[PDB]
Design a protein around this nucleic acid. Structure first.
Lengths: 489, 489, 489, 489
RNA sequence: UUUUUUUUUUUUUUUUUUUU
RNA sequence: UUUUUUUUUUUUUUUUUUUU
RNA sequence: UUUUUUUUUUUUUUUUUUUU
RNA sequence: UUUUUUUUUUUUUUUUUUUU
């Protein structure tokens, strides 16, 4: 089956490639300029705007009688990079919404109303944009609405998304994204700035239910087994302030605790195009199905492949303010961060894989990715993840457990007077947990969080990777060369 | 009658012996290598595969047009131990299905279609394999299908069996086996991975009925008198989630509560062969009818008899992973565990009987019993259960009861003005229990379980054996030397 | 507002007229032959086939590889009446689906995907076809699927409709239609011949829910206040056989009981065209907005207007079998029956309005309305409803009620020793009804139905019309001449 | 589908033919002697004995220690016709049960344990034997056990069958067969000469139930709609004497009343062989699939085909006692009677179809069909049903009914003071019948039977056939020549 | 102390809480 | 390893704790 | 007086109670 | 037009109402 999954993935990407090629020709993009990651972003952006069904309802509500509003409902704009003489600039490409719909309906089928097929791939792109926004600008103008601070922001990977995508992206969003959503849903229940809703998810659960259930379900799919999932089960029976308080403490606990939260790679569509043209310029050996997965070393193959000759803008100006500034390899880091979701990964790990030193925001420099008045083109530094690694989704070891099977209430076939390993107390706990015991779970689980943090603050002594874990060479997808990132100071 | 039962048992075993001798010659097994318990297991295994009527229906369904599938439907393989120069290895013995059928039809009669005659003895062997699997590997690859956790696994003695055997083995299976089966039957009613069925059992009950009734009947044959059997009677009138909830709490209660659940011994067929050859090498004094019972001290006679000179493999490698490892006497323990069903018996009791210290899984080491690339032979440590004991099937004392006959509503022949021991309340309870009272029995019996556990948590003060119970010497089947296993720490 | 409702109705009909004129020219229909009611039906029929989204999904499923299936997916056929020398026949008109879509998208807008706009008007037409089928042939070939008998059929006005229309037509369908639907939905839950679904209805209820709720809602919108609506509220908590039993008894009760069920008129589109051409031939005085309502005397104005000169076929042959047969005025009756939904109205009432004797099926004769091999044209008998009447939707008087406001538990400001009209018993009933009392409502409401029928069997003494009710002349829309249909035998 | 039904039927018969050919060779039957209908019967007889699972259980019970009983359990005997010099005699053919099982398991598959496949075809043969017995000897030695008189015997078509077949043959057995069975089941409940049982029938009803339900179900499948089926529904709630009384009166009523009871044809297997050899001797034109149905004119095709040259014994002796005796054409009548189930058909109808006068038992002569000491062969009279007819299963017209749809409790949309066709009384009857009204149904239905008989005694005026019904020529399967059997005296 | 069924899979992977 | 919703807004502003 | 769904079938057979 | 059970007996006696 996984080979056929790589094939369906390869077709999915080939569709995105065919759309993008058509989009590039549609706005008049020069052949070399098609490679541009900024152009990837611009097309992907335009597709979000067109596909924003909610915002289209609202647009209609204010579209009014004005013939200028009505004509601009037919036009679609795309700010794109165009180059000449090694210099580069923006152009305002324009095509009608039916032109964009034609390409989309042609490649994905007339039933774009299969919200699953278009929304899956567009969720992945919107997530990549959300990633890049998150590394860029700490979401300030959105958090002035979404009302929460920097630590909450760190756990809120993917929370730059338009609301419609948040259901689609369930697995990969950082726990804070869901938490912030719930906290803001309680504000919406005061403010009326919202419409409440009901949904269903085939292949997962045919349950037919609201954001309340959906969020709680996603929260259960994320939280740590035992106490935190037990708080997740309690959640419908917390009061609203108890929900906010619980959300806060769980969110804080999630700053340490790393239960199942899903990584993903999303390279830009122009990098997928770059992979196609690379395969072409390699004369019939690099095969996209070999790269066609949302997981595993195939992702590092694809990124380092893009690291041969892919192209992007350099503005002389900065996403910065002081006189200290730094090079295109920092853009290359930013791209990598956005592509693999590295924003809360270990910089040391990354420093070894990228095989160059890593950084914090006080050090990070980049451009805006938005097509320029004037600037210059640049191409990729070779092989950049000169070491790779195996991906993953949770903490190395959950907690120090019970006895595995023995030391329970002993059975006795033989008629012999006996001691026993009497353990009725933990047996009654197992009954209490499987019967769904609920009494003062708020305080009880607050305490359990406090002491779990302490236990973890011991467990750190070995709590470090899946136990084969090292930064192997690109000559060593074979995992032959196990080596550590750093000793310390 | 019991003497004639030992005779019919001895004939039953002699048939198994004749089959095994023929099987040993059929695959070309060396005379000494016939003794091998691994060879016992391999023949018994092959017989299951051949006799798996359900899986033969399914095999036919996928057998298709392929001449390689059709030829391998005629071949039967047997991986067996063969030895040379004190070293040992596997050989792939091969015989046609008709060769195996000839031996079977010859010794048990042409009507192997007497599913009772073949299935009884093969159920006992399949149960022994299920026992050995259970001690080996905590049934992981089966429980990924059967969906339940370690405590449930402990109560599920015999649940490694193919489905067809589970009806046959009704008495001896651990309660969890039945429970897990019911819970998975409810999943099958969703999933369609099953065919539902109807059966009848002569000498027991001519009722003609489904897994629902069969399971409930077996469950009634196991559960504790009063509340738990009353829940057993209610069971058809629980809703499906109530059934799952009830099953869970009853299963938990069964971790403490020990109502009637049936022990058995099954020594390997090669150990029965070893008993024959031992009798032979003893020149006309050890008699198999003296050993021919599924119960009583005759079982310890047979096992310790096997403990003279029986032989089995030693691989240098391990069913283990860390650098800590330990000897063939641990295999000897494993064999004993599998033979007598000791997996939830008291280790202290066993430690005194085996007259050596006993262990939990963190300490237990063994080999795979599967014929090797390379290895060495070893023979038994002498007399190993140097103490024995009397077997049994239930808790020593059910509960503190009523008055035995007095303190009921008094009769009065004599015309005399009188007080009375007025007891109409418990009289109305006896009427309610014999009329089958049903109203909120779920919650009522949940509560009764809660308080029964508490009562038992008092009753532990003496709840220990049938009152004559001690670990007497092998010189003392006469029960002359009553002595306790341990005082404590 | 009602004047503007007549205007929106007039535009709605003018659209249907423009569609029909275009359809008539599209299949090549002769100018006089455009008037033909059979041609109305044929166009309306073709529009159903084209608009049958469900059956188009199924058509695609079996359309296969065959180039003959694919070409006939592009063709659309229409069997239409064509006349010459006073004789008439069929012709197979043909146009491409895009030709039909052009006319429709031109007149109703490109967004025919506004399922409301097209489906409203087409529901009314499909209902008229369902009416005509019902009077024709007692739905035999459909009831061989829908599994219910002649009395059920009488209450099932509109149940010839394709499923998609049944939601649209909610108000006007006879209660049996809904009932039969529910009973067949329970069969579909066994048989799997269906896909279950969810819908929402703006301006009525934003609830978002299945056929179960939809049907129960429509059933509540129909059933008699008090007991029958209380059974309607219980309905989700009846078991499936209880639902069938309840449905049966409610359906039987509905044979007597006449709570709110909605009349409608639907004249043929060719009769609306006839109204246009009549207005034209009258030189600028008959105005369609004057006729533009689904209710009120404007309907009799329109029908009698059609009664001037409208034209239709006479076949010499019959929807009949014996040698007894009868004239075009019987077609005129059939048309009227289909147009006003008279199939369960009083024949005596109708006999006075049509001002000629009325009939039962043993007497009713008509043709098939399906274009012929050979035949002759005929035109309308003048003024035909020479008396009219006021329309309506429920029984004249619900039941003999309580006291209207007095005889409740008396208040007392003044400090005076007093008797009281003590009525705590009916006060507790009002509490029980407003709290939603549910206990044995099945038997209780069965009994209430039994005794309500008896009460009604008394109440018949005056249970006859809205109290102004008589068959006034066409010279007397002014209701000046109150007169009774019949005295009796 | 019916063509494929004729094909599956043709394969079913070809299997019976292949079995019979093998059986004929197995007992050493001469090539011409294979045609013999007596040989058909003898093989069919032997197959019943072998397949009598119940009687094989009983045989084992008395088989004892005797080596003569044990050897005759392996032997199977077949008394067969053998001919020489135009004379004929018996021979005792012998083959082992495994020889018979080989032919059967070879042609029908090893799983003869598919009781459906073997039992269907053998039920049809056993029914034919039961038919021939019934015409022969009025079942005297069986009715000395089954305790009922000549009129009951006439309605008991197929009641010579062994019990096991009676479930299989459900449709075609005369109502008396079921009735007699029920009456004798009540005697078995006293006498203990029986084991009671439970069964299930796929494609019909998955209900899992006893002879009580099975019989009542078959009785419901037979009885007249309305009163007699209503008595059928009551039946579980009649007392035992009420059941006997009801059975008697229903049985008497069935002497007049002809509700749905199923005809069948079963020609002898040697006549099917004769059809094969006829096709062969016709050089490649008569095709068995053309004849392969349990219904329709294909049956008369097959019988008249057999009427060319098929052969059977003539003994000079008689199934008779007086000096009056008559020819082989009377055997030909007997064969026809047995083949088509004519025993209670109209002799006049049959006289016209067979195109020769018909008879009652005082006139009927035949032989025993049991192979002789001495005798002579004879062959068929040509074309014998020189007229044919269309088959059928019920009375021509059930009763004079209600109004078909009109004259129910009138609805009123229009607000007009009105009379009504008030019919609440029959409406309450329809409610009583659909609610299952039960009070004194015994006497009520006794009365309904009395008056229904009177009504029928009027209705006889036209109660005669399906209305196209006549004895058309064999040149006129085209039904072109409608003509009546007799005028009268 | 006693008496029969059969359409979701086998001839390996670690010291382990949930569909890898 | 698998499968769908939609009425609070976008085509810029700094090294920053709260509605500027 | 007001406002949207879609996977069991169509371009004929009699005066009729149940899967012809 | 469609789909499985099994513990009261067989390889002969007349033109006849009940256990000869």
């Amino acid at each position: 089956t996984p080979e056929e999954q790589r094939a369906k993935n390869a077709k999915t990407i080939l569709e995105n490639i065919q759309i993008y090629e058509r989009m590039c020709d549609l706005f008049g993009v020069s052949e070399d300029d098609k490679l541009i990651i900024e152009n990837s972003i611009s097309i992907e952006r335009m597709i979000r705007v067109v596909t924003d069904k909610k915002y289209q309802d609202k647009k209609l509500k204010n579209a009014g009688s004005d013939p200028e509003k009505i004509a601009n409902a037919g036009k679609v704009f795309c700010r794109l990079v165009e180059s000449t003489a090694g210099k580069c600039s923006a152009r305002l490409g324009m095509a009608l919404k039916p032109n964009v719909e034609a390409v989309l309906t042609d490649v994905l089928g007339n039933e774009l109303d299969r919200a699953a097929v278009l929304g899956k791939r567009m969720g992945f792109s919107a997530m990549f944009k959300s990633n890049l926004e998150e590394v860029l600008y700490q979401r300030g103008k959105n958090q002035l609405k979404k009302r929460n601070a920097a630590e909450t922001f760190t756990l809120s990977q993917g929370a730059s998304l338009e609301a419609r995508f948040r259901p689609i992206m369930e697995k990969h969003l950082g726990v804070g994204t869901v938490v912030a959503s719930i906290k803001n849903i309680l504000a919406s229940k005061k403010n009326g700035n919202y419409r409440n809703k009901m949904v269903r998810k085939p292949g997962g659960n045919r349950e037919s239910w609201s954001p309340l259930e959906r969020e709680i379900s996603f929260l259960n799919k994320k939280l740590f087994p035992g106490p935190m999932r037990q708080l997740c089960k309690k959640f419908e029976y917390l009061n609203e302030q108890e929900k906010q308080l619980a959300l806060n403490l769980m969110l804080d606990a999630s700053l340490i605790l790393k239960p199942q939260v899903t990584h993903k790679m999303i390279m830009p569509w122009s990098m997928w195009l770059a992979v196609k043209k690379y395969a072409e310029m390699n004369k019939g050996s690099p095969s996209l199905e070999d790269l066609a997965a949302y997981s595993g070393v195939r992702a590092f193959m694809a990124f380092n492949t893009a690291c041969y000759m892919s192209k992007f803008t350099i503005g002389k100006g900065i996403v910065g303010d002081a006189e200290i500034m730094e090079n295109g390899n920092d853009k290359m880091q930013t791209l990598a961060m956005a592509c693999f979701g590295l924003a809360y990964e270990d910089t040391g790990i990354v420093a070894a894989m990228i095989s160059q030193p890593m950084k914090k925001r006080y050090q990070l420099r980049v451009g805006n990715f938005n097509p320029p008045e004037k600037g210059t083109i640049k191409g990729t530094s070779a092989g950049y993840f000169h070491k790779w690694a195996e991906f993953g989704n949770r903490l190395p070891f959950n907690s120090f457990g019970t006895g595995e099977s023995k030391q329970i209430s002993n059975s006795g076939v033989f008629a012999v007077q006996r001691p026993s390993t009497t353990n009725i107390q933990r047996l009654a706990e197992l009954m209490a947990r499987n019967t769904g015991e609920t009494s003062d779970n708020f305080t009880q689980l607050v305490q359990k969080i406090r002491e779990q943090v302490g236990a973890f603050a011991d467990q750190k002594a070995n709590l470090r990777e899946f136990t084969g874990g090292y930064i192997y060479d690109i000559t060593d997808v074979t995992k032959s060369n196990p080596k550590i990132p750093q000793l310390g100071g």
